[PDB]
Symmetry: C5
Subunit: 101 residues, 5 copies
């Protein structure tokens, strides 16, 4: 029943108005926030929980770590030592001696 | 088509209405959610999956680490040592002796 | 009511107009921004803060770590040593001697 | 040229209908997705890629690390040792001997 | 001014059209992008910046770490050593000798 001329103008004028305006979001519906919680927020909570588990290892601005024990090592240098016991020895060569008695 | 005065009224009144309202989002379309899943949610899953792998290394607030085995070390101090075996020796000097015979 | 023909036209024309337009978001309302900050922004702050605690441990492109100390180690190689002080010894064998006087 | 009553009604009724409806988002325009990619998705990619570089270091639930080598250490205890070579010695004292 | 029957039909029909349609987002207003930059993007940037600092420590698929130097260790095993210098010794016992002259 609306004339074609009016119907044409209505569609064109309504599209022009919709595009001229800007849209202020309200609080979303519960259906949107449920979706968004699954798509984003719950995943952020899991990421934050995992990060926290790692950061609880930080003490005094150092990350506490654990290594196998005892830790296998190779000493690469010549070490100065102090011998604490009397040592049993086997003399292997013929020794020059000065008799003092 | 309606008069210019009517068209001007309609454009202004409709824009005014669109901007006076606030908009409550519903569940998005399947097309929007598929796009958003690729743009955001799937990437959050990969981030969470990578963090999970790191956090599996944590036990009692210490991060388990691995170093080369065996680890090359350099001993910096003078070490007290206890010699446990008999030692073969070569006497390099002429020795003063007292004969107890 | 208006005509059933007019009503069908109006539904089709209005949906077609709404779907032909594109929608420019303004700054959201206070209701939305409060929800969004709780759903996203505050969780990002929490993540950022935890990460900063970890990254504070990084010094000049190395992560500072703490290991139990003194660390138990097991030395796997034969170590060169230097004996600095006089060692007390006990000769275990009969020594061949050349008397020089 | 609508009547004033109609103009007043149309403003109030249109606001009411807009507030009562809920709005289903379609696939966004290319302009929106281009902007959103810059604002969000590209930064998520950078974050994910940085995390992967760190997580490649994880081997069987341990983080592979590197320390300066050789690692400087201080031995805190007295060490039992086994001498494995013949030792050149210089005798310092006058030795008591029993002949043959 | 319209009749109540029209007014009621218009409200019901317009809500029905608004809910039957779906909405294609254009590029958002400057107001929106400025708010969104503060609420999300700038926080992502800080997260990425902090993560970059940690990942700079990765070299050849290992994380570079620092421990206190020198690190205190406890040697748990008996160590084989090679003495490298001449050793001054004091003979503590009476030595049996075979005179070879």
């Amino acid at each position: 029943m609306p004339s074609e001329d009016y119907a044409i103008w209505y569609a064109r004028a309504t599209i022009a108005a919709l595009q001229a305006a800007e849209y202020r979001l309200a609080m979303p519906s519960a259906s949107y926030t449920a979706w968004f919680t699954d798509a984003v927020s719950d995943k952020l909570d899991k990421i934050s929980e995992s990060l926290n588990t790692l950061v609880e290892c930080v003490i005094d601005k150092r990350l506490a770590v654990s290594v196998p024990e005892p830790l296998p090592v190779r000493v690469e240098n010549k070490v100065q030592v102090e011998v604490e016991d009397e040592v049993r020895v086997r003399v292997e060569n013929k020794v020059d001696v000065e008799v003092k008695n």
